[PDB]
């Protein structure tokens, strides 16, 4: 009955379809603790299998919690899941190892790529927003009051771009 009460909490977690972060590893852990010593005496292999299925979901739930998310879906056996499913995923994310952990490392990299791309998009805004600081000369025209402040940004950004160029994750936005 406790094995059916765990299969229901999983079906409830399936119906939820939302990033599982805390409750999934807790519900499966607390029961499996009082089940391990009992399941040897209980025997009933269907209960141990359900406890095994509850443990695998507790593992997959921590892994579960953009272009990087679509690339994540790709290396797990799934297609616009992290799109259509992260929205409303019954048990596609939960179902989908070393090939899993290698995929996870390819998404953390894809997450770092995007974070640098956002950093470059931040640069592009401030160059547009800024305007050469024109100061009084009498009009007997105007002149650049501070070029040095803009020169500091040029080298700072050139150094940031050179620092990004050294990272392996620059290659897509390296152009």
């Amino acid at each position: 009955d406790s094995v059916i009460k765990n299969i229901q909490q999983f079906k409830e977690k399936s119906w939820q379809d939302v990033s599982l972060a805390k409750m999934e590893e807790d519900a499966g852990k607390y029961g499996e603790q009082c089940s391990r010593l009992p399941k040897d005496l209980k025997e009933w292999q269907a209960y141990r299998d359900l406890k095994n299925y509850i443990d695998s979901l507790r593992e997959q739930l921590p892994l579960i919690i953009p272009r990087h998310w679509e690339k994540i879906k790709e290396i797990t056996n799934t297609k616009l899941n992290y799109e259509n499913p992260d929205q409303f995923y019954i048990e596609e994310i939960m179902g989908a190892l070393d090939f899993r952990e290698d995929i996870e490392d390819i998404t953390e990299s894809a997450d770092k790529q995007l974070k640098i791309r956002t950093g470059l998009d931040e640069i592009n805004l401030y160059w547009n927003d800024m305007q050469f600081q024109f100061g009084i000369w009498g009009k007997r025209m105007l002149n650049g009051l501070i070029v040095g402040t803009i020169l500091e940004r040029l080298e700072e950004d050139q150094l940031q771009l050179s620092t990004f160029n050294s990272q392996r994750h620059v290659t897509p936005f390296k152009a």
């Binding site: 800024m130 305007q131 025209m141």
Partner: protein, 49 residues
């Protein structure tokens, strides 16, 4: 320096029209003239001295 100043008068007449940074850096007339005007000013600077 009568003529030189006109070419510089026109650069700062062009600066009012388009004031953004990325334009002024890439702007056609202003990129090409600063090297030329510099040699023209430096030659009138050295001649004054």
């Amino acid at each position: 320096f009568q003529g030189i100043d006109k070419n510089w008068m026109k650069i700062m007449e062009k600066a009012v029209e388009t004031k953004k940074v990325i334009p002024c850096c890439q702007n056609d007339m202003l990129k090409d003239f600063l090297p030329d005007l510099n040699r023209k000013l430096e030659d009138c600077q050295k001649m004054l001295e």
